[PDB]
Amino acid sequence: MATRTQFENSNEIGVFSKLTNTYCLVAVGGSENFYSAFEAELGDAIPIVHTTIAGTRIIGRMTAGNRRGLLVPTQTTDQELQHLRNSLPDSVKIQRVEERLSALGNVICCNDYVALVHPDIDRETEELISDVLGVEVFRQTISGNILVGSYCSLSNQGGLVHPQTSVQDQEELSSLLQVPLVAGTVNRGSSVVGAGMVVNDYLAVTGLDTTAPELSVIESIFRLQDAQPESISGNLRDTLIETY
């Protein structure tokens, strides 16, 4: 279920990590506390790989992938690609992408079935993403936010968007993604939901600054806790009204 975790002293879990339904990536910065924090929830069930992208700890924003495959920017060295492939099973596709944009994690927000991309993403990159991830691709922006990969979080169970998302925009995007969406905040009101936390079909990790109401909202929307597929969110309505 939802678990609170922090980097060295940063609450942006998604910046320094990328968690999928079959593999997880963490930065090599400082120590293994982040690696041990991820292990405490996933253990040895799925591979956990220490890897860097372009010699930086921001691999989470630089890379985007799902259970079917992983995508890395052109700036990634061949050594990092080989290490990632060897640390990952052959069932996970890995391929480099060549385009003007490089922040794949911020440019692409996707799950195992549907993917959102930057409106200006080129045709070749869109086709490559579709082929690699086996997911539908749609040109969309979250209530005018062009960085779909940073201001939104998506998973097969549900998705989360920044609070400024209009109700009509939320309704349209939920129907397009075929998953429920809720407007909320992470890391004590931080608007970058896609960078402040990572989530999959069975695990969610967020910054320590995430207040109890935010954690409960995340649990309800992403359907982590048993017998809580947003059902308990109805009870959270009164709590949100009192707090808001």
Partner 1 sequence: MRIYQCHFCSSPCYPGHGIMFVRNDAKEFRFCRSKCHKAFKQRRNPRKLKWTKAFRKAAGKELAVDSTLTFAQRRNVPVRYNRELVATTLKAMARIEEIR
Partner 2 sequence: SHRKYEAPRHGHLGFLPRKRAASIRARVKAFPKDDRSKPVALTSFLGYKAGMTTIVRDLDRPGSKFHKREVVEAVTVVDTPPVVVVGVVGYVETPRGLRSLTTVWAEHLSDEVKRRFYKNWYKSKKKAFTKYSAKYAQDGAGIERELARIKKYASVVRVLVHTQIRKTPLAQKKAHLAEIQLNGGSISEKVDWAREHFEKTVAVDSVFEQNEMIDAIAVTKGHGFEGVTHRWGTKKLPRKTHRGLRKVACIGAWHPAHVMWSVARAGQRGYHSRTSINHKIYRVGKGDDEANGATSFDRTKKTITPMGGFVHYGEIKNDFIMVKGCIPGNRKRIVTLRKSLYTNTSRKALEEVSLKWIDTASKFGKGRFQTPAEKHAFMGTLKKDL
Partner 3 sequence: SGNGAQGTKFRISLGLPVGAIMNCADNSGARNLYIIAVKGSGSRLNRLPAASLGDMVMATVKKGKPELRKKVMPAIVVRQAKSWRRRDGVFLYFEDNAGVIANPKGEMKGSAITGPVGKECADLWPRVASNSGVVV
Partner RNA sequence: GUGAACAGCCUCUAGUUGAUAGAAUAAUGUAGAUAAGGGAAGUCGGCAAAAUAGAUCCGUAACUUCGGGAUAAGGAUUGGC
Partner RNA sequence: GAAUGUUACCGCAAUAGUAAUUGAACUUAGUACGAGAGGAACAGUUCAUUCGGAUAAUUGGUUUUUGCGGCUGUCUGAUCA
The correct pick among 40, 45, 208, 240 for binding RNA (CB under 7 A) is: 208
Q: Examine residue 86 and tell whether it contacts RNA (CB under 7 A).
A: no
Sequence-ordered list of residues with C-beta below 8 angstroms from that of 237, at least 6 positions apart, any chain: none
Binding residues for RNA, how many (CB under 7 A)?
Answer: 6
29 touching partner 2, by CB under 8 A? yes
Task: Tell me: does residue 17 bind partner 2 (CB under 8 A).
Answer: no
Distance CA 215, CA 219 (A): 6
Alpha-helical runs (H) found in 57-178: 59-62, 78-87, 104-107, 123-133, 148-151, 167-177
* C-alpha distance from residue 195 to each of 24, 62, 152, 161, 237 (Å): 15, 11, 8, 11, 25
Q: Which of 3, 125, 141, 144 is nearest to 64 (CA)?
A: 125
Judged by CB under 8 A, does residue 33 bind partner 3? no
Coil, helix or strand for 193? helix
Tell me, residue by residue from 115 to 154, as one string, x for binding to partner 3 by CB under 8 A and - for no binding.
---x--------------------------xxx--xx---
Q: What character string, x for contact with partner 1 (CB under 8 A) and - otherwise, covers 95-134?
A: xx---xxx--------------------------------
| Binding residue (CB under 8 A) for partner 1 from 77, 91, 175, 239 | 77
Q: Among 28, 49, 94, 103, which residue interacts with partner 2 (rule: CB under 8 A)?
A: 28
CB of 103 to partner 3, least distance (A): 5
Residue 98: CB atoms within 10 Å: 10
Beta-sheet strand order (sheet of 24-26): 17-19, 24-26, 48-50
What, of partner 3, RNA, partner 2, none, does residue 118 touch, CB below 5 to 8 Å by kind?
partner 3
* Contacts to partner 2 from residues 55-114, by CB under 8 A: 55
Closest CA to 141 of 112, 162, 127, 125: 162
Would you count residue 197 as binding partner 3 (CB under 8 A)?
A: no
Q: Which of 11, 17, 22, 52 binds partner 2 (CB under 8 A)?
A: 52
28 binds, among RNA, partner 2, partner 1, none (CB under 5 to 8 A by kind): partner 2
Assign 93 to helix, strand or coil.
strand
Instruction: Return the half-sphere exposure (C-beta side, CA atoms, 13 A cut-off) of residue 184.
Output: 31
Span near partner 2 by CB under 8 A; candidates 28-36, 58-66, 67-75, 200-208: 28-36
- Report how far residue 55's alpha carbon sits from residue 215's, in angstroms, rounded to the nearest whole number: 32
Residue 31 lies near RNA (rule: CB under 7 A): yes
Q: Does residue 139 bind partner 1 (CB under 8 A)?
A: no
Question: Containing H/E element for 39?
Answer: helix 33-42
Task: Report the interface residues with partner 2, using CB under 8 A.
Answer: 28-31, 52, 55
